[PDB]
Subunit: 114 residues, 4 copies
């Protein structure tokens, strides 16, 4: 059956939700770009830890037990939240940056040359 993401939240929605979250706790002061980047690195580490002893040939994440699927959802989400916060703190329009990068990707890797 086709796998799709839900239509919401959008990246702007996530930015907005995280900013409201941080602002309520007076955490803006901690959200300097290098702080957010190191926090991102920490969550990428937590993501890697889930996969480190999983063989490639055995069943994949669809088959993991419920607690491990929950942990996977959480870590993928933590990476995304910090990425969004970082992009916003740097005044980068992340959705449009992705459009521009995908165009660059198509030129670097034209279909006929692969």
């Amino acid at each position: 059956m086709p796998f799709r993401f839900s239509p919401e939240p959008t990246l702007e929605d996530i930015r907005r939700l995280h900013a409201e979250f941080a602002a309520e706790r007076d955490w803006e002061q901690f959200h300097q770009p290098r702080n957010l980047l190191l926090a991102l690195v920490g969550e990428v580490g937590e993501l890697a830890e889930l996969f480190q002893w999983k063989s490639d040939t055995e069943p994949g994440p669809q088959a993991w037990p419920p607690k491990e699927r929950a942990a996977l959802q959480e870590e993928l989400s933590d990476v995304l939240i910090y990425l969004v916060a970082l992009a916003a703190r740097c005044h980068v329009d992340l959705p449009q940056a992705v459009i521009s990068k995908m165009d660059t990707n198509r030129q670097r890797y034209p279909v006929h040359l692969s």
Copy 2:
């Protein structure tokens, strides 16, 4: 002035665009979850490299020269693209996972206790 992301593309839009990109090049075969995760780690490295010698107290990424802003947009985008691909390859509904993680974040960090 308020900083906002553009309303599109959405995360579903990005998933769709990346899948079409990969499928055209017969790259699905390379997109196993640990491959995508290691590729993500590589792009997080490229992102870190931009910041490694930047002092925190000096002007931030808004002030970087055009070539460095371009590189920043690209690396933030490459991290996001692989994160999206990874989440999709694991059948994780990334937007809804983020909603669930933000709820968890609010319980762990109630406003009155910070």
Copy 3:
């Protein structure tokens, strides 16, 4: 005056980690990609110690005992898995470093 202790050497660490793994029948888990992902995990744990540190507050030489203990452990975890990974790949890590430092001097002349 700050120095590292003269032992263990990287070969000593290789030997100790191999014996640790072999006793537990863990060689089967220590494939290069598994060790690399484990390394990435520990790099994350290291980053976590620094992520919220302001410029004005004390630097790691001055960190309280609990935080210095955690720092020693994470720097050590990164090193142990790096050693294991290099050994699993049959890379002579000490000599590779000498070769890399020479390359670094050419890339970065004074």
Copy 4:
């Protein structure tokens, strides 16, 4: 039979990297968070070598000369910055590893 060379030791690497940095007046750039981010960069370069490697194709012992050269360099880059970071933090990395291995034995009894 696979062994690392007996030298350089971690103290030897510390010394060599400090002299490399000091000659170029780079101490000012080698603050702990800068070194940690640089380390993360090199971990990324290491990951890139493995990212598209299938299970069936040759493992790193068997990699062609160009790829083995790249592997040696990235493992070395990770180690050099890890050493620099530990030294900048006044952490006795060799002895920290001994302490961490003891902790590992208690956490993971047979």
